[PDB]
Amino acid sequence: VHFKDGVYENIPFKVKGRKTPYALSHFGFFAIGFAVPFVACYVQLKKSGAF
Amino acid sequence: MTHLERSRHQQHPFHMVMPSPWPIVVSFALLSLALSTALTMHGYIGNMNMVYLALFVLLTSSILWFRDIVAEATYLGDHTMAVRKGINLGFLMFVLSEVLIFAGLFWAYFHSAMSPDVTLGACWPPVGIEAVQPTELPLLNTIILLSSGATVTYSHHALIAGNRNKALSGLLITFWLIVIFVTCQYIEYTNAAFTISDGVYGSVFYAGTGLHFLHMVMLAAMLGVNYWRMRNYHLTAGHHVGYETTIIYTHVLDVIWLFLYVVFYWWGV
Amino acid sequence: ANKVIQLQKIFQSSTKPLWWRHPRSALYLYPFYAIFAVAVVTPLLYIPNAIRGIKAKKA
Amino acid sequence: GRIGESWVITEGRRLIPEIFQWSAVLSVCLGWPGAVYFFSKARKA
Amino acid sequence: MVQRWLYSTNAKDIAVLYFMLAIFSGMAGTAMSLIIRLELAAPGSQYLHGNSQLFNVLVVGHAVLMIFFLVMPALIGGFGNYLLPLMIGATDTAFPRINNIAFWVLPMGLVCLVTSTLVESGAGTGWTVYPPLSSIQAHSGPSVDLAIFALHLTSISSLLGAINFIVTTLNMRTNGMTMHKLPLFVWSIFITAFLLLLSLPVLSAGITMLLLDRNFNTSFFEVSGGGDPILYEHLFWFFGHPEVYILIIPGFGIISHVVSTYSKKPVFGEISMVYAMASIGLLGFLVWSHHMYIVGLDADTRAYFTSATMIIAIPTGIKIFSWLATIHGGSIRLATPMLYAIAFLFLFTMGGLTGVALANASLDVAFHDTYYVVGHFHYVLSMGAIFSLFAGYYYWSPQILGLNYNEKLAQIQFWLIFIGANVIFFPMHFLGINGMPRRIPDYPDAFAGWNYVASIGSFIATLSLFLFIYILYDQLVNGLNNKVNNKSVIYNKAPDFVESNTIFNLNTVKSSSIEFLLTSPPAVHSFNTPAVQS
Amino acid sequence: SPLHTVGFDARFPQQNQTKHCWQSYVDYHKCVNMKGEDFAPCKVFWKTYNALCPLDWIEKWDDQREKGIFAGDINSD
Amino acid sequence: KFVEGLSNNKYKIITGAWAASLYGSWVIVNKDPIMTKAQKIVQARMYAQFITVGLLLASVGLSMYENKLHPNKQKVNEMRRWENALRVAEEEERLEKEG
Amino acid sequence: EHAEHREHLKHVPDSEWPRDYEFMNIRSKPFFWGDGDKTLFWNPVVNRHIEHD
Amino acid sequence: DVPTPYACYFQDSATPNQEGILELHDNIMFYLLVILGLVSWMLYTIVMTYSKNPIAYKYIKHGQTIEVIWTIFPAVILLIIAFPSFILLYLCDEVISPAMTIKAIGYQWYWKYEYSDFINDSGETVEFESYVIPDELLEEGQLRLLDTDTSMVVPVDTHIRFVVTAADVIHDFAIPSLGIKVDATPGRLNQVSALIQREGVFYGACSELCGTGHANMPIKIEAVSLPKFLEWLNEQ
Numbered sequence A: 001v002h003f004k005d006g007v008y009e010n011i012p013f014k015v016k017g018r019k020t021p022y023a024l025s026h027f028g029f030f031a032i033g034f035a036v037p038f039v040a041c042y043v044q045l046k047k048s049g050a051f
Numbered sequence B: 001m002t003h004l005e006r007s008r009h010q011q012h013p014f015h016m017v018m019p020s021p022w023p024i025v026v027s028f029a030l031l032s033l034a035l036s037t038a039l040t041m042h043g044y045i046g047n048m049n050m051v052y053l054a055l056f057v058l059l060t061s062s063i064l065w066f067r068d069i070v071a072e073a074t075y076l077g078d079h080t081m082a083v084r085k086g087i088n089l090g091f092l093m094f095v096l097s098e099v100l101i102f103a104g105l106f107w108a109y110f111h112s113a114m115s116p117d118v119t120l121g122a123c124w125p126p127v128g129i130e131a132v133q134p135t136e137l138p139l140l141n142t143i144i145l146l147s148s149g150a151t152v153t154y155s156h157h158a159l160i161a162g163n164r165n166k167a168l169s170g171l172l173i174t175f176w177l178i179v180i181f182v183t184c185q186y187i188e189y190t191n192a193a194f195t196i197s198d199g200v201y202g203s204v205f206y207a208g209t210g211l212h213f214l215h216m217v218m219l220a221a222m223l224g225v226n227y228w229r230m231r232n233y234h235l236t237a238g239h240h241v242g243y244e245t246t247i248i249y250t251h252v253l254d255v256i257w258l259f260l261y262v263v264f265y266w267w268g269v
Numbered sequence C: 001a002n003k004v005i006q007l008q009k010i011f012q013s014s015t016k017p018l019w020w021r022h023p024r025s026a027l028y029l030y031p032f033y034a035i036f037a038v039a040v041v042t043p044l045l046y047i048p049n050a051i052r053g054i055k056a057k058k059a
Numbered sequence D: 001g002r003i004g005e006s007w008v009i010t011e012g013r014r015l016i017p018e019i020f021q022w023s024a025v026l027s028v029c030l031g032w033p034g035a036v037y038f039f040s041k042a043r044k045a
Numbered sequence E: 001m002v003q004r005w006l007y008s009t010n011a012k013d014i015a016v017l018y019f020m021l022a023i024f025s026g027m028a029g030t031a032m033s034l035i036i037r038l039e040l041a042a043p044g045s046q047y048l049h050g051n052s053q054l055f056n057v058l059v060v061g062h063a064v065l066m067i068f069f070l071v072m073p074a075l076i077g078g079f080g081n082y083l084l085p086l087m088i089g090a091t092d093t094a095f096p097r098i099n100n101i102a103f104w105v106l107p108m109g110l111v112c113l114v115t116s117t118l119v120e121s122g123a124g125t126g127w128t129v130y131p132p133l134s135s136i137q138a139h140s141g142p143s144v145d146l147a148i149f150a151l152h153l154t155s156i157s158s159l160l161g162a163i164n165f166i167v168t169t170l171n172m173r174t175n176g177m178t179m180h181k182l183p184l185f186v187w188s189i190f191i192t193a194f195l196l197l198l199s200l201p202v203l204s205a206g207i208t209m210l211l212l213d214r215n216f217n218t219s220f221f222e223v224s225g226g227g228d229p230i231l232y233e234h235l236f237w238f239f240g241h242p243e244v245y246i247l248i249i250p251g252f253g254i255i256s257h258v259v260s261t262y263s264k265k266p267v268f269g270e271i272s273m274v275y276a277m278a279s280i281g282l283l284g285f286l287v288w289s290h291h292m293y294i295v296g297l298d299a300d301t302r303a304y305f306t307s308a309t310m311i312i313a314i315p316t317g318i319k320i321f322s323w324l325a326t327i328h329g330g331s332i333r334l335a336t337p338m339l340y341a342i343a344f345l346f347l348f349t350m351g352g353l354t355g356v357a358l359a360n361a362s363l364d365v366a367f368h369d370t371y372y373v374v375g376h377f378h379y380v381l382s383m384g385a386i387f388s389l390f391a392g393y394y395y396w397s398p399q400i401l402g403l404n405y406n407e408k409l410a411q412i413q414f415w416l417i418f419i420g421a422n423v424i425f426f427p428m429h430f431l432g433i434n435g436m437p438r439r440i441p442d443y444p445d446a447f448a449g450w451n452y453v454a455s456i457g458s459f460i461a462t463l464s465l466f467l468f469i470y471i472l473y474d475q476l477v478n479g480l481n482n483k484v485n486n487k488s489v490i491y492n493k494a495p496d497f498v499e500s501n502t503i504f505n506l507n508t509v510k511s512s513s514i515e516f517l518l519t520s521p522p523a524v525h526s527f528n529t530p531a532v533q534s
Numbered sequence F: 001s002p003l004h005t006v007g008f009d010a011r012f013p014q015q016n017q018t019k020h021c022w023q024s025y026v027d028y029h030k031c032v033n034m035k036g037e038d039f040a041p042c043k044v045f046w047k048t049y050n051a052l053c054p055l056d057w058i059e060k061w062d063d064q065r066e067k068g069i070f071a072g073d074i075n076s077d
Numbered sequence G: 001k002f003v004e005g006l007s008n009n010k011y012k013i014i015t016g017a018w019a020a021s022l023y024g025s026w027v028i029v030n031k032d033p034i035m036t037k038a039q040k041i042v043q044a045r046m047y048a049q050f051i052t053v054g055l056l057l058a059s060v061g062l063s064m065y066e067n068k069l070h071p072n073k074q075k076v077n078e079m080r081r082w083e084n085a086l087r088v089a090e091e092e093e094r095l096e097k098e099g
Numbered sequence H: 001e002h003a004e005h006r007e008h009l010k011h012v013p014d015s016e017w018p019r020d021y022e023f024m025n026i027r028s029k030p031f032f033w034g035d036g037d038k039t040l041f042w043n044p045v046v047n048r049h050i051e052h053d
Numbered sequence I: 001d002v003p004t005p006y007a008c009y010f011q012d013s014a015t016p017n018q019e020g021i022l023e024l025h026d027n028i029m030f031y032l033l034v035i036l037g038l039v040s041w042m043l044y045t046i047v048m049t050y051s052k053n054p055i056a057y058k059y060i061k062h063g064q065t066i067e068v069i070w071t072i073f074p075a076v077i078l079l080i081i082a083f084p085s086f087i088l089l090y091l092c093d094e095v096i097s098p099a100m101t102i103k104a105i106g107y108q109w110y111w112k113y114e115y116s117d118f119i120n121d122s123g124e125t126v127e128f129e130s131y132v133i134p135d136e137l138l139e140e141g142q143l144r145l146l147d148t149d150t151s152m153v154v155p156v157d158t159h160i161r162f163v164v165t166a167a168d169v170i171h172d173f174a175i176p177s178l179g180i181k182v183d184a185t186p187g188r189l190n191q192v193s194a195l196i197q198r199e200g201v202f203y204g205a206c207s208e209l210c211g212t213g214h215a216n217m218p219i220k221i222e223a224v225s226l227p228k229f230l231e232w233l234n235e236q
């Protein structure tokens, strides 16, 4: 089966027809991407000293 | 012929593979294997049961992948001559990558051998370590690879010719020949004066010979699969790319064994 | 035992995917799905025990 | 060329104003460490 | 949709996933660069109080994450997987499940690298993970084992992609592509895929020797016991220089294409340029120990390597001279990938000149493990590979994604990353020649100014990436409105002078490769029939 | 005024000197075990190893010589 | 009496003879213009390694043909180096005393 | 010949086994399988751990 | 000798090797700045006179004359650059006839210096472990993180060759003022030479990763005159 082609059927994100705004998913992706070293720093700063 | 029954085909010789779930599963199994063998090397989990099942699920996913590729290659029938030359060149480049791992091991041996450290007694082989003499068991399992190459090349040239009773006899006796090689190699390992921890000599010696050991047990599994699909009439007289693949592999394994054997058993003692 | 053209006539003439198209391919994939799900979900419950640092109970 | 204002003059007129602005953009693409050193307390500011 | 994104043996829908992990890991790596340069902003124990092991963990995470999970995916994996079948007319690549498993064994290397930085304080060695700093006596724990299992998985991914690329442009070319008629990015991906399978076997052999003398009691680099740690430096840097030549050669291909198409001129001597690039590839193996001028080599072999690294330096010079020759005499349309292409030339020539200042084995004794080296590679790696990455995205994604971006936001993003990254790595040279060593948490408080200037710059270089994230969002939800409502640029190749508008609407795209003739987002079976060429 | 030391040996002119110390030590123990048990101008070797290689190496090699697990054996009977 | 100099380089002559053996087998087998490249390469490789490991035992017979002429080596070259190491100490400290 | 030699060195009492060198029998960390001092093909006749008297 | 805030040049000369390194770096930068200036000038001239160019000379794609001149010019400049670095590399390993020797063996997060040229007529070798002063016991004028409670002290105007090694993780003996930088790997001794031409202090740091205490690992070398060094060595 050849999957049908369009302007928004090339990416894994669904953008147009949703229930939530797209900014939620699009900025939460880079929120968890930008906050994985912060949670590494937190789990490393509770293991040795304080914080 | 008619345009109407020419446009009902592929329009280019190359392969169009249907979406198959064996990159994702074997990648899952590779992740589980890596994490479990990083986790059991420090006593976090109790036994080696979990690295055993991780290695087993990797093995059975990859053999299901090879089941899918033999079904697609000889049942659905897509491996035309362009795809055959493609997978042939791909296997050639993969084996060119394997021999560079062997070259890195030989670099380790040469660098710690021809400039020996002052803690080894400044002599290669080091003091006290009774080195393996190259003329007893190394001579048998360096002539057995040449005999294996000779019988696998006449089994190949009998497969191209047309006789079945010769092209099957050569494959059966090369399988039993190299498994006799593997068993006497294990016999050589289980009575040797040095272990893998005894100095740097035992370390790099067992690293090189053990990598060649694992390579030929993988070759023996490949040749068992090839003998099964030669008995079950999959291999033809002009479309045996999965057998030319393994004879290229066993001949380059023979020559890398002779390199490893010469500089690991004659010059290095 | 020269059973390649019958397998080809079966394998071309179906709609099911390729890893489910064989007759005896039910005995190869259900226990595989079971043991694969077990074998890959199981270190992800031992990883927080490693993050907390508590080792095994061996010896 | 043969007839017209000479090529030396008509390309000097094009390029001589370009040398000073090249020197400006290079003196501010490599010379801003001088401008940040000039205001700090190491120069007894 | 599960069979289109999880099984998905189609080289167009694997490159998007490559790019998604690329932007995810690049965000994580620049969060680590922000945390590093935020802690190094002032002497005395800043934000992470004490705890130098955490800083070592953060710097190895930044280095290895941003090398092996942003630059190598978003240059080799993503761009090669989307464009190498789409420039030579293959319907898509050979061995499709191989470049599906390459992508799908990337993020498990990522998750084991992430969970390596949590267990038993952590792997801190730097990305050049050395013994006996990483052997079990001086570094105990299962951390660096997961940290190098990540390198095993990324190594396997890149080699499988290399074999995939090599066979798919050695056999499935279109009807008229001869052995020397390919566009130069195909040649870059070609030669890079050769250097991968000629180099990284040695890497994986050396690092699995490191693993089985950590845990399996062998003695490759454990020195009291026979071995030597110099053998790891040899076995690592034999990959370590071909790795960055792998990371920079598709950058040369991308920059060649964008300066060819934004100046309305073919590249000056494409055959001599591809000969220079191929000789750079086959010569980059012979200079692997210019990172080891200090450890105790003889002056004779040091003389050989400082002879050979300058012959490494010359064909990059003739490539940059051909770039100046092919932008000379053009009709340069200064759009946002052409701006990145223009900045790459200057900001890589600067790093290459300080690199040949480093390449003298005489002069490397004053500069080794010193912030001069950081100023060199954070030019030629950062500005080089990522200005080529931005000049790849801003030039190709209107064709791939099919949604036109905003133009003025792209130009403020370029000028913000240009200013705010030129202010970081330029004081690193003064920190280097004044005497600051590498990998210190912080420093003796003499040179307290240039670190503060670099830290006030890194916030600009992070804010420009936040604006790039907003550019991605504004492209994804306002693509068609940026097509219509006159916020973007629509034609990358302008109409020529004496050509009418009614005549430009006949021949819209004057390309020289296939990619700008396919429709925005292209069909899943683009070349049903082969694409002929004479 | 004087500050004399080992000078420059012609056998080992490289940057490394580990073979130079190990050979000078093993040849000190090869002079003073063989020709005469102690009276000599082979105090040159003693001067050389005690000038060149560190005290932890000398202590490790002397305890290895006492236990008999020395690497390059010194022709002892 | 030539055994000394061209048995010091055993593993140079063996390796050069292996390369020349594969070349002189390949140029023989490739003149047959009917086969695949791969079959020619593996047959040449087999002939080459057979003659090479056949020469490896001829060098063993030659190795004890050298060993009767120079008994118990690796241990009396060490003492020649030791005599040159003791002379360099005595020659030096005698002029240290009288210089 | 090697089999009769291994039967010769079977009955040797273990303190008569020679004290051998620093590089032989290195143990950085203990082996995670077995008792702690046992490799894969560890023959208990030819590869004894002397434990330094 | 010591670093200075907002400096953009070398820690200044002490040794002939560092003087040669400074002269060589200025010669290399003098040959590099022509190339940087003409590359920046070519880029500026092109992008500010061909942006306002409406047509493009698309029929200029090769020329052999200018191609071979821009491929034979970097070979010439790189030969002129490589011509004195061979002289420096082959003279900075010339350690013929040094006066005295030092061992500088580096442990975990400190150094241990030892002199064993036997003119200390107490009889013994002299060693001292050379820990960093921890940064709360500093007393009103002491340079932070690169001071030392027990300095190494060397003489002026004698060639001194010191070997270096470790007992652990690979360290580096690195002083940028004396121009000396050599990796102390735990397996081998590595020797480098020096001729310090003036009295005074010289500071340096470890320049290889050691682990947690990489920053807290300095080198302090006071160079005094020869009678004061003889008095110090006899007294200590």
Ligand code: HEA
Residues within 6 Å of the ligand: E022, E023, E025, E026, E027, E030, E032, E033, E034, E036, E037, E059, E060, E062, E063, E064, E066, E067, E070, E071, E074, E125, E126, E127, E128, E374, E378, E381, E382, E383, E386, E389, E390, E393, E421, E437, E438, E439, E440, E458, E461, E462, E465
């Ligand atoms: C990929 C290579 C790479 C890049 C780009 C960078 C960029 C940065 N690095 Fe560095 N760094 C290294 C690799 C890199 N680094 C290596 C190998 C070391 C040596 C480690 C060691 O030896 O111990 C090192 C060391 C190092 C040091 C020296 C510390 C020391 O060793 O003492 C510092 C200090 O400032 C630092 C921080 C930063 C910061 C703030 C940036 C900023 O420039 C980050 C900002 C970057 C961007 C904004 C780029 C855009 C990002 C995207 C995600 C774009 C997405 C686009 C597409 C996918 C098309 N890293």
Ligand code: HEA
Residues within 6 Å of the ligand: E128, E243, E244, E245, E247, E248, E290, E291, E292, E293, E309, E312, E313, E314, E316, E317, E318, E320, E348, E349, E351, E352, E353, E355, E356, E357, E358, E359, E360, E364, E367, E368, E369, E373, E376, E377, E380, E381, I035, I039, I073, I074, I075, I077, I078
């Ligand atoms: C992206 C990979 C990459 C690339 C392309 C380069 C480019 C070069 N590098 Fe770099 N380098 C690194 C990656 C790279 N480097 C890394 C990762 C480190 C740190 C490793 C660590 O952790 O220790 C490092 C540090 C480093 C070292 C190690 C120093 C040390 O650690 O002690 C050396 C040594 O020779 C070096 C030299 C060079 C040279 C001569 C080039 C040349 O290829 C540059 C070529 C470009 C030009 C030459 C300019 C353009 C040419 C002209 C304008 C013509 C005229 C020029 C001349 C006549 C010279 N750099």
Ligand code: CUA
Residues within 6 Å of the ligand: I106, I109, I170, I171, I172, I206, I207, I208, I209, I210, I211, I213, I214, I215, I217
């Ligand atoms: Cu010692 Cu860093």
Ligand SMILES: [Cu+2]
Residues within 6 Å of the ligand: E240, E241, E242, E290, E291
């Ligand atoms: Cu390099």
Ligand SMILES: [Mg+2]
Residues within 6 Å of the ligand: E368, E369, I208
């Ligand atoms: Mg270093």
